[PDB]
Amino acid sequence: GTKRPFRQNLNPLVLLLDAALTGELEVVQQAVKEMNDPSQPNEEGITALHNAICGANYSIVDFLITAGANVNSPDSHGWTPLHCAASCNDTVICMALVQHGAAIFATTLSDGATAFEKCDPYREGYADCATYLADVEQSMGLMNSGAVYALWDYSAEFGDELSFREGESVTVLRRDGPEETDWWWAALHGQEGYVPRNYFGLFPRVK
């Protein structure tokens, strides 16, 4: 025990990530106060919220979302918190993410899969989680008078596309245009144009 010298400047992120994973709510709470950024990723693109979800620590998921953890943060492989939650058929976490601004149509980096597609047919809760995510997919651009919330800036690359800012309420006019499966015809400040599905949530972010 003698030999190892003590560290004077421990990294709150390393403590946060470990706590989020093992299930140490109080450690996570103190670590969040300490640093600016709870949503800060490690090398792999893994956040407190990722670890909390894979650890199945519902109390820490809830605390991290409320404190304004990035519900859309992709890891190295383009897996969002919603992808991870779906892969465990975790309907309760899927609901909490969607309700705090998760992008239902977000696609992974390699092979371009949605959260719905990551549901595990050989584990409890498959039907419940698949049903929920498919219902959110259906509901998007239909609920809230077609209003959906931009989760990033976008710059039109053709004249029939709509530019928009992070946070802006965009109104979907037509979804199922057979001409585009990944794009909606939408309205913002009396402009009309195609917007990409995967940029939007059913609810806004927390600040």
Residue numbers in the entry: 616 to 822
Question: From the publication, what sentences describe this entry?
Answer:
The ASPP family of proteins is involved in modulating the transcriptional activity of the p53 protein family members, including p63. Despite their antagonizing functions, the ASPP family members share a highly homologous C‐terminal domain (CTD) which mediates the direct interaction with p53 and consists of four ankyrin repeats (ARs) conjoined with an SH3 domain. Here we characterize the interaction of iASPP with p63 and show that it binds to the linker region between the DNA binding domain and the oligomerization domain. We further demonstrate that this binding site is removed in a splice variant of p63 where a stretch of five amino acids is replaced with a single alanine residue. This stretch contains a degenerate class II SH3 domain binding motif that is responsible for interaction with iASPP, as well as two positively charged amino acids.
We wanted to investigate the structural details of the interaction and solved the crystal structure of the iASPP CTD in complex with the p63 linker peptide. Since the KD for the interaction is with ~90 µM relatively weak, we fused the p63 peptide (amino acids 332‐342) directly to the iASPP CTD (amino acids 625‐828). In the crystal structure, the p63 peptide of one fusion protein bound to the SH3 domain of a neighboring protein of the asymmetric unit. The p63 peptides of all four chains present within the asymmetric unit of the crystal lattice adopted an almost identical conformation with differences only in the orientation of T335, Q341 and F339. No electron density was observed for G332 and D333 at all, whereas G334 was only resolved in one chain. In detail, the p63 peptide adopted the conformation of a class II SH3 domain binding motif (PxφPx + ) despite the lack of one proline. P338 occupied the second xP pocket, whereas R340 contacted D775 and E776 of the RT loop and E795 of the n‐src loop which make up the acidic region of the SH3 domain. p63 R337, at the position of the aliphatic residue in the canonical class II motif, interacted with the RT loop as well by reaching towards E776 of the acidic region. The aliphatic moiety of the K336 side chain partially occupied the first xP pocket. The proximity of the W767 side chain could also allow for a cation‐π interaction via the ε‐amino group of K336. The ankyrin repeats (ANK1 to ANK4, dark grey) do not contribute to the interaction.
